[PDB]
Structures are given as structure tokens and as C-alpha cells.
Amino acid sequence: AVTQSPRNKVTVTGGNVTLSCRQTNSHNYMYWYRQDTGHGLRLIHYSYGAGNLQIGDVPDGYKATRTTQEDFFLLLELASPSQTSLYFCASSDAPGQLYFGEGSKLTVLEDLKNVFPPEVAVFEPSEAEISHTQKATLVCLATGFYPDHVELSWWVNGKEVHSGVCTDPQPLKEQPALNDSRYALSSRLRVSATFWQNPRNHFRCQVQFYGLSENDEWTQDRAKPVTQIVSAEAWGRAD
Amino acid sequence: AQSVTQPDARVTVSEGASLQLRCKYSYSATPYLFWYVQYPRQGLQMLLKYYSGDPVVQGVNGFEAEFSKSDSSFHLRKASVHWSDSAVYFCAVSAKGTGSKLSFGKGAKLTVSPNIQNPDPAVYQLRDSKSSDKSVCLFTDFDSQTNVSQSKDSDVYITDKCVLDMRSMDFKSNSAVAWSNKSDFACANAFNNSIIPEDTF
Amino acid sequence: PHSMRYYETATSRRGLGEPRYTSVGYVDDKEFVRFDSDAENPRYEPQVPWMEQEGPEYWERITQVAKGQEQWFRVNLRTLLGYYNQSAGGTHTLQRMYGCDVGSDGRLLRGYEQFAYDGCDYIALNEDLRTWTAADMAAQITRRKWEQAGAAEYYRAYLEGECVEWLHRYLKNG
């Protein structure tokens, strides 16, 4: 069991970030990795026992402290956009055998001027499908969000569901040309047409979005794009 | 000094079919070899490990890896891949005296293709529950093989195929999604790229 | 029938001080090499005529291992404190002994990997080379940990290989 936090954080160039990792295990070795598609996992720093530090493969722009046996901190003092990555913490008491944490997604923005929360819409099943297939398929769409830092979930009558769900593994630049384009994500939820045709059943698409923090500046004629949850719903309909 | 090579970042195989993910590494007189698997939104988990002895390391779930002195390789194999096996697989190594510093491969996204038994390609129009008109087109229920392509228009959006599983009743289906907020857009107007002549509208 | 043994020894002191590490090599009962941390130039050095013919990289490499074993012992003394719930003031001694028994045909007959805390048996690699014998409940923890991580196999790598090999390389200088 390796726990790290924060799981998600957005910051701007120059900011100061600290990633925490605690291990219930009593392992001596602890590691900090970054994962970037195209580079896999690259070691930043690691530690053999309390109060020990050893440079990794890519330690530039990072600092680490092994304060105790069970605690290991990664320290970004001058956040560069290049440091945008998925960070992992691991422990080990045997050579080459690492236990990993769930990871911490960190987006390092250049400019908050372009941060915008997603717009969520739910689209009801097609009638033809209902008759042809005997199954109803809902679609959910998250649009106009930046950065690419979201989590989409489906909810049926108060409970998050996974069966019958499938969300795009990757978003897509609404306008790929722009360097900092808005993103759009789609998900599907399929259920037995019987279930959909019951007006008692309630369907909700939920999008968690990580944007600006509370204690952050925002000097724009916009609705401040803060970490938030945006949802769109739909009731079953018999017809 | 130490290097780990995984040839292909993308690998797809049909459920039930066999599988081999390749891994070559820089030579060490004694090398410590490992495979790690990473399911969606999780970290890495150790799948297999080799130190010495019988060069065939057998995993309890049908996976196995073989150490090859000559090839200096540690290829991963599975006779029959289950659908759950969809994940990113990493090959890692460490050498004597640094056996606690792993070298990792770029990884491999294993996509376990769904075996669509009763495919009936189709395209349905799904309408916003809130806004009465704003809508979306849905390519769905098609065959495992067939694929989707980027928008030719570039003003229209479209997402690569995606497999869902209605576990409750042992059923699976593929799905693509098209849409463009430009009011002018039709079902046949999208997916114009290599779709089965058998799909409905 | 020939033998080879290595005895490593670390001894914790008080306060801000790294332990005193000691390693001595035995070729069929005769000391042929020795390392000590106290010496102004802490290095591996020959204790026997023939052994002085090995190159500088061999001593530089063999000395490098020592540096690592010090890091290991330093950390593992601490660990043992917890296992036996001992004050961090006390001074203790952890000793390791490993090696291999070669047959007349120069083959491998027996292997050795075992530890002792302050003189008492802790854990020892059995004869089958795949199981361990734990002395006390504390060692029973190390055992379980080594059972799950494949301690035997890990070591069995060096044993079946370099150990046997290098032994013969020494039996040619006698």
C-alpha cells in the first residue's frame, strides 16, 4: 500500500509544488518516477532508508527529502511546463520488485488565460436502435475544456456504474492547429432498452475537472475556471 | 549502460488468441528480469520475475516469460489472452550491484480485440436531452476487424472505436462517435471513411 | 573437495558514527583476503602470496562491493533494532557468512548464506538451497519476506555461477 498526494494538481510556470508519498509497508527503498508516453517510466530520485538521497536518471528541476522511513517527498521549486507529467511513487524491500502508488497527474500551465472547464451534454438513445437492437445507448460529451485534466463517470440512480461503459482513452484537440487547443471527450453507456424506457430510472454523466485553485489570481471578464464538477442528466422515457 | 527495448508500443490480439510481447536488453553477466502490467488509472504491478534457475518463469494466470542467455531477451507469452488482459505491459531490468535500480521499456499498450459474433453495423442519431436539437451521430454494434479514421472534413469530430461490455448479460460491442456543432451534418455525412456497406441509417 | 567462505561483520557504535565493517575471505580455511573500514585507506588487500597477482581493477571492483555492503549493513542494523524492540543507544553486531562447497569433480556440493545477530543464529539457507531456517520470531519475519521475494533464487544466481567459477580460479594459484 503506497499512497501519494495530491492525486491531481494544476499549476503555472514558476509555481511551487510538493508531491507526498507515504508507505504503510516498512520498505527501505522508495522511488519517484515520471511517466510520459514516448519515454515510459524515468527515475527522478530514490532513497535507501530514512535520511538518504540518490540522484536518478532525470533529476533536473527536482529535489527530494526522505524525512522518515515511511515518507518520501518530491519537490518542484520552479515548475516548468515540461514537468507536466504523470508522477509515480514506489517502495521496495527486494531487488527490482516495486510497489506503486495510484499516481499524481500534474499539469504545468504556461498561462491561466486559457483555462476553461468542460461543457457536458447527454444525448438520449435513438428510437431505431431501441427497436432494432432492443438496447438503449446513451452518449456523453465533454467539450471546450483545457487543460486535459478530467475524469468522467456515469451514474445510474445514485450509483456509479462501470458495466456497459466505455470512455475514450484519450481526449482530442477541438482545433489541433492551436498549441493550447480546447479538448473534447466522449463516453458511452449502454443499457437494456427495457431499463431506459422506465421513467423512474435516472441517468447522469459526471465530469470532474481540475482547474484553478481557490487561492489563485484571476483577472478576466470570464467565469473563473476553478476545479469543479459539471454534470448533465437524462430521465428514462417510455413513449 | 543498461538498456531495455520493447519493439512495439501498440499491439492488438483477438480474445482467445495467443500473444507474445517482445523485450530485448543490454547484456549483463547476471541480469535481473521483470515484467510489469499497468491497468487503466492504476500504477504498475509486478507480473513476473527472474533471477536464476529454470529460465521459464510461469505466472499463475497463464502468462509466462523466458530468459534467453543467447538472445539476451525476456519475452512475455500467453497461450490464450482473456479480455481483462488489456493493459500496458512494461519490461524492466536491473544488473548485479544495481539490482534495485530498474531500467524500464517504453511499454506496450495491449488491446484485446472483442470477438463480435453477431455483428450488425449501424448508425443512429442521438439527440440532446436538454437542448431539443443539438445532436450526435453514433456508429456502433459493428465487427471487431473494421476500423474508424480521422475526420476528412476536419470541421467534424470523430473518436476512434471503443469497446463496452454489458457484463450483466455477457454482451460486448464497438462504438464510434461523430459530431460537429455546425448545424449542417448528417449520419452518412460522417464515417464516410471505409464503413461497411451493410450499416443501417 | 574444496571450500570457500566469506565472513562479513558490521558493528554499530554510538551517536554520529558509521559502523565498523569487516570482511575476510577464506580459500579452504586459509585467509587470502581482508577488508576493514578503520584503515586510513579502507581497501581490499591480499593476505597470501599468489593473490597479489590480480590487477588493480579487481581490487577496485572488489573494494566497490564492500562500499555497498556497508550501506546494506548500516541500514539493516537499524531494521533489526525494531524487530527486537531495542533502544537506539545500544551497540550491536551483525555478521554474514556465505560460500560454496565444490566437489572433487569441481562441481557444486553445498551452498551457504546465513546470518547472526549479536552472536545468536538468525536465519540460514538450508541444504536444499531453496528454503530457510529461522531461529526466532524476528527472523521468522525476514524469512517470510524472503520467501515471497525469492531470496534463495536471487542468491542461487551468484552461487551456481561466479562463486564456483572464481573458486577454481583461485585453486589454480596454489
Binding site: - | - | 566469506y6 572488489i62 562491493v65 538468525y122 524472503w146 531470496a151 536471487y154 561466479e162 562463486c163
Partner: peptide, 9 residues
């Protein structure tokens, strides 16, 4: 040459 670091206790 000799053995590698033992696995932690």
C-alpha cells in the same frame, strides 16, 4: 568477484 547485496532483512 563475490556476491551481490543480500535482500533486506
Amino acid at each position: 568477484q563475490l556476491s551481490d547485496v543480500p535482500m533486506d532483512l
